[PDB]
Design a protein around this ligand. Structure first.
Ligand SMILES: Nc1nc2c(ncn2[C@@H]2O[C@H](COP(=O)(O)OP(=O)(O)OP(=O)(O)O)[C@@H](O)[C@H]2O)c(=O)[nH]1
Lengths: 427, 50
Protein backbone atom coordinates (compact mmCIF):
# COMPACT_ATOMS: atom_id res chain seq x y z
CA UNK A 1 0.00 0.00 0.00
CA UNK A 2 1.09 3.59 -0.66
CA UNK A 3 1.51 5.97 2.28
CA UNK A 4 3.39 9.09 3.38
CA UNK A 5 5.40 10.04 6.48
CA UNK A 6 5.67 13.73 7.40
CA UNK A 7 8.72 15.72 8.52
CA UNK A 8 8.44 19.16 10.13
CA UNK A 9 11.69 21.11 10.52
CA UNK A 10 12.61 24.51 11.89
CA UNK A 11 10.70 26.95 14.01
CA UNK A 12 8.16 27.35 11.16
CA UNK A 13 8.27 23.68 10.32
CA UNK A 14 6.67 23.68 13.74
CA UNK A 15 4.30 26.43 12.55
CA UNK A 16 2.90 24.51 9.65
CA UNK A 17 3.15 21.03 11.07
CA UNK A 18 0.78 22.09 13.81
CA UNK A 19 -1.70 23.79 11.50
CA UNK A 20 -1.57 21.15 8.73
CA UNK A 21 -2.09 18.10 10.93
CA UNK A 22 -4.89 19.73 12.88
CA UNK A 23 -6.69 20.66 9.65
CA UNK A 24 -6.53 17.10 8.34
CA UNK A 25 -7.72 15.68 11.65
CA UNK A 26 -10.71 18.03 11.62
CA UNK A 27 -11.42 16.93 8.05
CA UNK A 28 -11.35 13.29 9.11
CA UNK A 29 -13.40 13.69 12.27
CA UNK A 30 -10.74 12.47 14.67
CA UNK A 31 -11.15 14.30 17.96
CA UNK A 32 -8.25 16.25 19.45
CA UNK A 33 -7.74 13.24 21.72
CA UNK A 34 -7.51 10.50 19.10
CA UNK A 35 -10.67 8.44 19.52
CA UNK A 36 -11.84 8.18 15.93
CA UNK A 37 -15.45 9.25 15.48
CA UNK A 38 -16.31 7.55 12.21
CA UNK A 39 -18.59 9.66 10.03
CA UNK A 40 -17.05 9.43 6.52
CA UNK A 41 -16.77 5.81 5.41
CA UNK A 42 -14.29 6.55 2.62
CA UNK A 43 -11.80 8.38 4.83
CA UNK A 44 -12.09 5.67 7.46
CA UNK A 45 -11.33 3.19 4.68
CA UNK A 46 -8.24 4.98 3.35
CA UNK A 47 -6.85 6.54 6.55
CA UNK A 48 -3.81 4.28 6.14
CA UNK A 49 -2.22 6.59 3.55
CA UNK A 50 -1.25 8.82 6.50
CA UNK A 51 -2.05 7.05 9.76
CA UNK A 52 -1.25 3.83 11.52
CA UNK A 53 -4.06 2.47 13.66
CA UNK A 54 -3.61 1.89 17.39
CA UNK A 55 -5.77 0.25 20.06
CA UNK A 56 -9.28 1.51 20.77
CA UNK A 57 -9.25 3.63 17.63
CA UNK A 58 -6.60 6.29 18.04
CA UNK A 59 -4.23 6.95 15.16
CA UNK A 60 -0.62 8.04 15.47
CA UNK A 61 0.31 10.63 12.84
CA UNK A 62 3.47 9.23 11.32
CA UNK A 63 5.13 12.63 11.54
CA UNK A 64 8.44 13.63 13.09
CA UNK A 65 9.35 17.00 14.61
CA UNK A 66 12.88 18.39 14.61
CA UNK A 67 14.10 21.61 16.25
CA UNK A 68 16.82 22.81 18.62
CA UNK A 69 15.22 24.96 21.34
CA UNK A 70 12.92 22.89 23.58
CA UNK A 71 10.57 25.81 24.21
CA UNK A 72 9.10 25.76 20.71
CA UNK A 73 8.67 21.99 20.84
CA UNK A 74 6.87 22.35 24.16
CA UNK A 75 4.66 25.10 22.73
CA UNK A 76 3.50 22.97 19.80
CA UNK A 77 3.19 20.15 22.34
CA UNK A 78 0.88 22.44 24.32
CA UNK A 79 -1.13 22.97 21.14
CA UNK A 80 -4.58 21.34 21.00
CA UNK A 81 -3.05 18.29 19.32
CA UNK A 82 0.37 17.78 20.91
CA UNK A 83 -1.34 14.89 22.69
CA UNK A 84 -2.08 13.35 19.30
CA UNK A 85 1.58 13.83 18.52
CA UNK A 86 4.25 11.44 19.83
CA UNK A 87 6.52 11.42 22.86
CA UNK A 88 8.29 8.86 20.67
CA UNK A 89 8.99 11.37 17.90
CA UNK A 90 9.91 14.20 20.31
CA UNK A 91 13.60 14.05 19.48
CA UNK A 92 15.42 17.34 20.03
CA UNK A 93 18.76 18.81 21.01
CA UNK A 94 20.12 21.16 23.64
CA UNK A 95 21.93 23.95 21.78
CA UNK A 96 20.76 27.36 20.66
CA UNK A 97 20.03 27.96 16.99
CA UNK A 98 22.05 31.16 16.64
CA UNK A 99 20.04 31.45 13.41
CA UNK A 100 23.27 30.14 11.90
CA UNK A 101 23.23 28.09 8.71
CA UNK A 102 26.93 27.29 9.09
CA UNK A 103 26.60 25.95 12.63
CA UNK A 104 23.43 24.06 11.72
CA UNK A 105 25.07 22.41 8.72
CA UNK A 106 28.23 21.48 10.54
CA UNK A 107 28.10 21.75 14.34
CA UNK A 108 24.57 21.34 15.70
CA UNK A 109 23.26 18.71 13.28
CA UNK A 110 26.33 16.52 13.75
CA UNK A 111 24.76 14.96 16.87
CA UNK A 112 21.08 15.07 15.83
CA UNK A 113 21.11 13.65 12.30
CA UNK A 114 22.08 10.24 13.68
CA UNK A 115 19.08 9.88 15.99
CA UNK A 116 16.61 11.42 13.56
CA UNK A 117 17.81 9.03 10.85
CA UNK A 118 17.29 6.13 13.24
CA UNK A 119 13.73 7.29 13.90
CA UNK A 120 12.87 7.86 10.24
CA UNK A 121 14.14 4.47 9.10
CA UNK A 122 12.34 2.92 12.07
CA UNK A 123 9.09 4.37 10.76
CA UNK A 124 9.94 3.41 7.17
CA UNK A 125 10.42 -0.21 8.24
CA UNK A 126 7.25 0.00 10.34
CA UNK A 127 5.18 0.87 7.28
CA UNK A 128 4.98 -1.12 4.04
CA UNK A 129 5.79 1.10 1.04
CA UNK A 130 6.12 4.88 1.05
CA UNK A 131 5.48 6.97 -1.94
CA UNK A 132 8.00 9.22 -0.19
CA UNK A 133 8.08 12.03 2.37
CA UNK A 134 6.89 15.61 2.51
CA UNK A 135 9.31 17.88 4.36
CA UNK A 136 8.16 21.31 5.55
CA UNK A 137 11.01 23.72 6.24
CA UNK A 138 12.40 27.18 5.49
CA UNK A 139 15.20 28.18 3.15
CA UNK A 140 15.73 31.59 4.74
CA UNK A 141 15.13 30.19 8.22
CA UNK A 142 18.53 29.29 9.60
CA UNK A 143 18.33 25.98 11.41
CA UNK A 144 15.53 24.63 9.25
CA UNK A 145 17.80 25.04 6.24
CA UNK A 146 20.86 23.72 8.08
CA UNK A 147 19.03 20.56 9.10
CA UNK A 148 17.03 19.93 5.95
CA UNK A 149 19.97 20.19 3.57
CA UNK A 150 21.89 17.46 5.43
CA UNK A 151 18.79 15.35 6.02
CA UNK A 152 17.82 15.26 2.35
CA UNK A 153 21.45 14.74 1.36
CA UNK A 154 21.66 11.55 3.41
CA UNK A 155 18.18 10.22 2.64
CA UNK A 156 19.04 10.62 -1.06
CA UNK A 157 21.39 7.66 -0.89
CA UNK A 158 19.23 6.04 1.78
CA UNK A 159 16.47 5.51 -0.80
CA UNK A 160 17.06 6.47 -4.44
CA UNK A 161 13.58 5.33 -5.43
CA UNK A 162 11.00 7.50 -3.65
CA UNK A 163 9.47 10.99 -3.54
CA UNK A 164 11.47 13.69 -1.74
CA UNK A 165 8.75 16.34 -1.78
CA UNK A 166 9.88 19.61 -0.22
CA UNK A 167 8.05 22.75 0.93
CA UNK A 168 9.92 26.02 1.42
CA UNK A 169 9.02 29.58 2.37
CA UNK A 170 10.63 32.25 0.19
CA UNK A 171 12.04 35.21 2.15
CA UNK A 172 9.98 38.37 1.83
CA UNK A 173 11.74 40.42 -0.88
CA UNK A 174 10.89 43.61 1.01
CA UNK A 175 12.45 42.35 4.27
CA UNK A 176 14.11 39.21 5.62
CA UNK A 177 14.39 40.48 9.21
CA UNK A 178 17.47 38.29 9.53
CA UNK A 179 20.07 40.04 7.39
CA UNK A 180 22.14 36.89 6.73
CA UNK A 181 19.08 35.38 5.02
CA UNK A 182 20.43 35.96 1.47
CA UNK A 183 23.61 34.18 2.53
CA UNK A 184 21.58 31.28 3.93
CA UNK A 185 19.45 31.11 0.78
CA UNK A 186 22.45 31.01 -1.54
CA UNK A 187 24.02 28.35 0.67
CA UNK A 188 20.87 26.22 0.76
CA UNK A 189 19.50 26.44 -2.79
CA UNK A 190 22.50 24.56 -4.19
CA UNK A 191 22.03 21.34 -2.24
CA UNK A 192 18.26 21.84 -2.28
CA UNK A 193 17.95 21.76 -6.08
CA UNK A 194 20.77 19.21 -6.36
CA UNK A 195 19.04 16.65 -4.14
CA UNK A 196 15.30 17.20 -4.50
CA UNK A 197 12.81 16.50 -7.27
CA UNK A 198 9.89 18.78 -6.38
CA UNK A 199 9.95 21.98 -4.32
CA UNK A 200 7.16 24.36 -3.34
CA UNK A 201 7.99 28.07 -3.22
CA UNK A 202 5.85 30.29 -0.97
CA UNK A 203 6.32 33.89 0.19
CA UNK A 204 4.71 35.74 3.09
CA UNK A 205 4.01 39.03 1.30
CA UNK A 206 1.56 37.52 -1.16
CA UNK A 207 -0.38 35.83 1.63
CA UNK A 208 -0.57 39.22 3.34
CA UNK A 209 -1.84 40.69 0.06
CA UNK A 210 -4.52 37.98 -0.09
CA UNK A 211 -5.49 38.80 3.49
CA UNK A 212 -5.96 42.42 2.46
CA UNK A 213 -7.68 41.50 -0.78
CA UNK A 214 -10.34 38.88 -0.07
CA UNK A 215 -9.88 38.14 3.63
CA UNK A 216 -10.13 41.92 4.20
CA UNK A 217 -9.97 41.08 7.91
CA UNK A 218 -7.22 43.61 8.77
CA UNK A 219 -6.21 41.69 11.92
CA UNK A 220 -4.39 38.61 10.59
CA UNK A 221 -2.36 36.09 12.49
CA UNK A 222 0.44 34.05 11.03
CA UNK A 223 -1.91 31.32 12.24
CA UNK A 224 -4.53 32.44 9.73
CA UNK A 225 -1.81 32.29 7.10
CA UNK A 226 -1.01 28.76 8.27
CA UNK A 227 -4.70 27.91 8.01
CA UNK A 228 -4.56 28.97 4.37
CA UNK A 229 -1.37 27.06 3.61
CA UNK A 230 -2.75 23.94 5.31
CA UNK A 231 -5.74 24.05 2.98
CA UNK A 232 -3.30 24.61 0.12
CA UNK A 233 -1.38 21.44 0.86
CA UNK A 234 -4.55 19.46 1.58
CA UNK A 235 -5.66 20.32 -1.95
CA UNK A 236 -2.89 18.30 -3.56
CA UNK A 237 -3.08 15.63 -0.86
CA UNK A 238 -6.77 14.73 -1.34
CA UNK A 239 -6.20 12.73 -4.52
CA UNK A 240 -4.65 9.56 -3.07
CA UNK A 241 -7.13 9.17 -0.23
CA UNK A 242 -10.15 9.59 -2.43
CA UNK A 243 -12.02 7.49 -5.03
CA UNK A 244 -13.31 8.39 -8.49
CA UNK A 245 -11.59 9.28 -11.73
CA UNK A 246 -8.33 10.94 -10.79
CA UNK A 247 -4.66 10.25 -11.36
CA UNK A 248 -3.55 10.77 -7.77
CA UNK A 249 0.12 9.88 -7.97
CA UNK A 250 2.70 12.52 -7.12
CA UNK A 251 4.96 10.65 -9.54
CA UNK A 252 2.15 11.06 -12.07
CA UNK A 253 2.31 14.82 -11.50
CA UNK A 254 6.10 14.66 -11.72
CA UNK A 255 6.18 12.94 -15.10
CA UNK A 256 3.37 15.15 -16.40
CA UNK A 257 4.97 18.37 -15.14
CA UNK A 258 8.77 18.20 -15.05
CA UNK A 259 10.17 18.73 -18.56
CA UNK A 260 13.88 18.54 -17.71
CA UNK A 261 16.14 16.96 -15.06
CA UNK A 262 16.80 20.22 -13.19
CA UNK A 263 13.33 21.86 -13.16
CA UNK A 264 11.84 21.51 -9.69
CA UNK A 265 10.49 24.79 -8.31
CA UNK A 266 6.75 25.30 -8.46
CA UNK A 267 4.21 27.88 -7.41
CA UNK A 268 0.72 27.28 -5.97
CA UNK A 269 -2.73 28.81 -6.35
CA UNK A 270 -6.11 27.86 -4.98
CA UNK A 271 -9.84 28.16 -5.36
CA UNK A 272 -12.74 30.01 -3.95
CA UNK A 273 -11.55 32.07 -1.01
CA UNK A 274 -14.85 33.44 0.24
CA UNK A 275 -15.03 37.15 1.11
CA UNK A 276 -17.23 39.23 3.42
CA UNK A 277 -20.49 38.73 1.54
CA UNK A 278 -19.45 36.46 -1.31
CA UNK A 279 -20.90 33.57 0.72
CA UNK A 280 -24.35 34.70 -0.40
CA UNK A 281 -23.01 36.83 -3.26
CA UNK A 282 -21.20 34.20 -5.34
CA UNK A 283 -22.72 31.62 -7.69
CA UNK A 284 -20.54 28.53 -7.89
CA UNK A 285 -20.28 27.97 -11.66
CA UNK A 286 -17.40 26.41 -13.61
CA UNK A 287 -17.00 29.70 -15.54
CA UNK A 288 -16.35 31.74 -12.39
CA UNK A 289 -14.35 28.92 -10.79
CA UNK A 290 -11.95 28.96 -13.73
CA UNK A 291 -12.13 32.76 -13.86
CA UNK A 292 -10.73 33.27 -10.37
CA UNK A 293 -8.75 30.02 -10.66
CA UNK A 294 -6.51 31.39 -13.41
CA UNK A 295 -5.96 34.91 -12.07
CA UNK A 296 -2.87 36.97 -11.29
CA UNK A 297 -4.07 38.41 -7.97
CA UNK A 298 -5.21 35.11 -6.43
CA UNK A 299 -1.75 33.75 -7.19
CA UNK A 300 0.26 33.92 -3.98
CA UNK A 301 3.72 32.42 -4.54
CA UNK A 302 6.28 34.91 -5.80
CA UNK A 303 5.48 37.65 -8.30
CA UNK A 304 3.12 38.35 -11.15
CA UNK A 305 3.66 35.94 -14.07
CA UNK A 306 2.48 38.88 -16.16
CA UNK A 307 6.12 39.38 -17.12
CA UNK A 308 6.71 35.75 -18.10
CA UNK A 309 4.62 32.96 -19.57
CA UNK A 310 3.57 29.52 -18.33
CA UNK A 311 5.71 26.54 -19.29
CA UNK A 312 3.15 23.96 -18.17
CA UNK A 313 0.14 23.85 -15.83
CA UNK A 314 -1.82 21.30 -13.80
CA UNK A 315 -5.11 21.64 -11.97
CA UNK A 316 -7.10 19.37 -9.67
CA UNK A 317 -10.70 20.04 -8.69
CA UNK A 318 -12.63 18.69 -5.70
CA UNK A 319 -16.37 18.17 -6.13
CA UNK A 320 -18.96 16.60 -8.45
CA UNK A 321 -17.63 17.66 -11.85
CA UNK A 322 -17.82 16.42 -15.42
CA UNK A 323 -15.25 16.56 -18.16
CA UNK A 324 -17.06 18.82 -20.59
CA UNK A 325 -16.80 22.00 -18.53
CA UNK A 326 -13.09 21.63 -17.80
CA UNK A 327 -12.61 20.68 -21.45
CA UNK A 328 -14.42 23.72 -22.82
CA UNK A 329 -12.72 26.07 -20.38
CA UNK A 330 -9.42 24.62 -21.57
CA UNK A 331 -10.42 25.47 -25.14
CA UNK A 332 -11.37 29.00 -24.10
CA UNK A 333 -8.19 29.66 -22.13
CA UNK A 334 -6.04 28.34 -24.96
CA UNK A 335 -7.82 30.42 -27.60
CA UNK A 336 -7.96 33.55 -25.43
CA UNK A 337 -4.21 34.06 -24.89
CA UNK A 338 -2.46 32.04 -27.59
CA UNK A 339 0.82 33.73 -26.69
CA UNK A 340 0.75 33.50 -22.89
CA UNK A 341 1.97 29.88 -22.98
CA UNK A 342 5.17 28.44 -24.43
CA UNK A 343 4.82 27.06 -27.94
CA UNK A 344 7.50 24.65 -26.69
CA UNK A 345 4.78 22.09 -25.86
CA UNK A 346 1.26 22.72 -27.19
CA UNK A 347 -1.62 21.69 -24.91
CA UNK A 348 0.56 22.17 -21.83
CA UNK A 349 -2.33 21.65 -19.36
CA UNK A 350 -3.19 18.70 -17.10
CA UNK A 351 -6.53 18.09 -15.35
CA UNK A 352 -7.71 16.00 -12.41
CA UNK A 353 -11.16 15.59 -10.86
CA UNK A 354 -11.52 14.44 -7.26
CA UNK A 355 -15.09 13.27 -6.70
CA UNK A 356 -14.99 14.17 -2.99
CA UNK A 357 -15.92 17.71 -1.93
CA UNK A 358 -14.49 19.44 1.12
CA UNK A 359 -16.72 19.53 4.17
CA UNK A 360 -18.96 22.59 4.05
CA UNK A 361 -18.56 24.20 0.62
CA UNK A 362 -19.43 22.52 -2.65
CA UNK A 363 -16.64 23.20 -5.16
CA UNK A 364 -12.92 23.73 -4.62
CA UNK A 365 -9.69 23.30 -6.53
CA UNK A 366 -5.91 23.41 -6.45
CA UNK A 367 -3.65 25.05 -9.03
CA UNK A 368 0.01 24.28 -9.66
CA UNK A 369 1.98 25.52 -12.65
CA UNK A 370 5.61 25.66 -13.67
CA UNK A 371 6.60 28.93 -15.33
CA UNK A 372 9.45 31.37 -15.84
CA UNK A 373 8.36 32.95 -12.57
CA UNK A 374 11.52 32.48 -10.47
CA UNK A 375 13.94 34.57 -12.57
CA UNK A 376 13.21 37.73 -10.61
CA UNK A 377 13.46 35.90 -7.28
CA UNK A 378 16.91 34.50 -7.77
CA UNK A 379 18.16 37.59 -9.62
CA UNK A 380 17.08 39.54 -6.53
CA UNK A 381 19.04 37.17 -4.32
CA UNK A 382 21.94 37.55 -6.78
CA UNK A 383 22.14 41.32 -6.40
CA UNK A 384 21.82 41.05 -2.63
CA UNK A 385 24.54 38.39 -2.39
CA UNK A 386 26.91 40.28 -4.69
CA UNK A 387 26.43 43.63 -2.96
CA UNK A 388 26.97 42.16 0.50
CA UNK A 389 29.85 39.87 -0.49
CA UNK A 390 31.92 42.47 -2.34
CA UNK A 391 33.06 43.72 1.09
CA UNK A 392 32.70 40.31 2.83
CA UNK A 393 30.95 41.70 5.89
CA UNK A 394 29.46 39.51 8.64
CA UNK A 395 31.87 36.74 7.66
CA UNK A 396 34.17 36.31 10.67
CA UNK A 397 31.47 34.30 12.46
CA UNK A 398 31.49 31.87 9.54
CA UNK A 399 35.29 31.76 9.42
CA UNK A 400 35.24 30.84 13.10
CA UNK A 401 32.70 28.13 12.38
CA UNK A 402 34.97 26.81 9.63
CA UNK A 403 33.84 28.10 6.23
CA UNK A 404 35.48 29.57 3.13
CA UNK A 405 34.27 31.45 0.07
CA UNK A 406 34.99 28.91 -2.70
CA UNK A 407 31.68 27.23 -1.90
CA UNK A 408 30.01 30.65 -2.12
CA UNK A 409 31.53 31.07 -5.59
CA UNK A 410 30.30 27.68 -6.78
CA UNK A 411 26.84 28.29 -5.28
CA UNK A 412 26.36 31.54 -7.16
CA UNK A 413 27.77 29.81 -10.25
CA UNK A 414 25.16 27.04 -10.14
CA UNK A 415 22.43 29.60 -9.50
CA UNK A 416 23.47 31.74 -12.47
CA UNK A 417 23.45 28.51 -14.47
CA UNK A 418 19.81 28.11 -13.45
CA UNK A 419 19.12 31.67 -14.63
CA UNK A 420 20.77 30.98 -17.98
CA UNK A 421 18.96 27.68 -18.48
CA UNK A 422 15.55 29.24 -17.81
CA UNK A 423 16.28 32.17 -20.11
CA UNK A 424 17.66 30.09 -22.98
CA UNK A 425 14.85 27.52 -22.90
CA UNK A 426 11.91 29.89 -22.71
CA UNK A 427 13.32 33.08 -24.23
CA UNK B 1 -66.09 68.12 27.57
CA UNK B 2 -68.30 65.93 25.39
CA UNK B 3 -68.19 62.92 27.70
CA UNK B 4 -68.90 65.08 30.74
CA UNK B 5 -71.73 66.95 29.00
CA UNK B 6 -73.37 63.65 28.12
CA UNK B 7 -73.04 62.22 31.62
CA UNK B 8 -75.49 64.79 33.01
CA UNK B 9 -77.56 66.46 30.29
CA UNK B 10 -78.50 63.38 28.29
CA UNK B 11 -77.49 61.20 31.25
CA UNK B 12 -74.88 59.08 29.50
CA UNK B 13 -72.50 56.55 31.06
CA UNK B 14 -68.86 56.04 30.12
CA UNK B 15 -67.90 55.08 26.57
CA UNK B 16 -64.12 54.78 26.20
CA UNK B 17 -62.56 55.39 22.78
CA UNK B 18 -61.58 52.36 20.70
CA UNK B 19 -58.18 52.16 19.00
CA UNK B 20 -59.08 52.33 15.31
CA UNK B 21 -55.44 52.31 14.18
CA UNK B 22 -53.65 49.78 11.97
CA UNK B 23 -50.50 47.93 13.02
CA UNK B 24 -47.62 45.91 11.58
CA UNK B 25 -44.99 43.48 12.94
CA UNK B 26 -41.29 44.44 13.09
CA UNK B 27 -38.50 43.19 10.80
CA UNK B 28 -35.15 41.68 11.84
CA UNK B 29 -31.52 42.68 11.25
CA UNK B 30 -29.18 40.77 8.94
CA UNK B 31 -27.08 38.23 10.84
CA UNK B 32 -23.66 36.80 9.93
CA UNK B 33 -23.14 34.11 7.31
CA UNK B 34 -21.72 31.43 9.59
CA UNK B 35 -18.08 30.72 10.33
CA UNK B 36 -16.53 29.90 6.96
CA UNK B 37 -13.68 28.18 8.80
CA UNK B 38 -11.19 30.66 7.35
CA UNK B 39 -11.22 33.89 9.34
CA UNK B 40 -11.79 34.55 13.02
CA UNK B 41 -15.05 33.82 14.83
CA UNK B 42 -14.95 37.31 16.37
CA UNK B 43 -13.11 39.56 13.89
CA UNK B 44 -14.95 38.27 10.80
CA UNK B 45 -18.12 39.55 12.47
CA UNK B 46 -16.85 43.14 12.44
CA UNK B 47 -15.49 42.57 8.93
CA UNK B 48 -18.73 41.26 7.39
CA UNK B 49 -21.17 44.03 8.35
CA UNK B 50 -21.22 46.94 5.90
N1 LIG C 1 4.53 29.41 13.78
C1 LIG C 1 5.25 30.56 13.31
N2 LIG C 1 6.37 30.63 12.38
C2 LIG C 1 6.94 31.85 11.99
C3 LIG C 1 6.34 33.01 12.52
N3 LIG C 1 6.90 34.15 12.10
C4 LIG C 1 7.88 33.79 11.29
N4 LIG C 1 7.97 32.43 11.20
C5 LIG C 1 9.09 32.04 10.30
O1 LIG C 1 9.57 30.71 10.25
C6 LIG C 1 10.90 30.85 9.78
C7 LIG C 1 11.63 29.51 9.81
O2 LIG C 1 11.98 29.05 11.10
P1 LIG C 1 13.01 27.83 11.22
O3 LIG C 1 12.89 26.94 10.01
O4 LIG C 1 12.63 27.06 12.49
O5 LIG C 1 14.47 28.55 11.21
P2 LIG C 1 15.73 28.07 12.09
O6 LIG C 1 16.82 27.40 11.26
O7 LIG C 1 15.27 27.17 13.21
O8 LIG C 1 16.37 29.41 12.69
P3 LIG C 1 15.73 30.88 12.49
O9 LIG C 1 15.77 31.25 11.03
O10 LIG C 1 16.55 31.88 13.27
O11 LIG C 1 14.31 30.86 12.99
C8 LIG C 1 11.49 31.97 10.63
O12 LIG C 1 12.66 32.49 10.05
C9 LIG C 1 10.32 32.93 10.63
O13 LIG C 1 10.60 33.91 9.66
C10 LIG C 1 5.26 32.95 13.38
O14 LIG C 1 4.81 34.04 13.78
N5 LIG C 1 4.70 31.76 13.79
Amino acid sequence: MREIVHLQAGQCGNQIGAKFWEVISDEHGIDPTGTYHGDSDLQLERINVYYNEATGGKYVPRAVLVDLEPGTMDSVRSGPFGQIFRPDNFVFGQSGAGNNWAKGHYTEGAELVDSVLDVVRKEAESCDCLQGFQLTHSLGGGTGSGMGTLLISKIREEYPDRIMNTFSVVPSPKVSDTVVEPYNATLSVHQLVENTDETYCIDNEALYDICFRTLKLTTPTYGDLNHLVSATMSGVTTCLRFPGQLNADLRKLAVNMVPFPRLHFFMPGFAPLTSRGSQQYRALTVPELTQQMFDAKNMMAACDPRHGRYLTVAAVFRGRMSMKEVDEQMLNVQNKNSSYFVEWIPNNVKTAVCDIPPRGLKMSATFIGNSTAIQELFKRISEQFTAMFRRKAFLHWYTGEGMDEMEFTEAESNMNDLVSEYQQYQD
Amino acid sequence: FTRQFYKDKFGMPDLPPVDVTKKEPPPVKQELPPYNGYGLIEDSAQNCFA
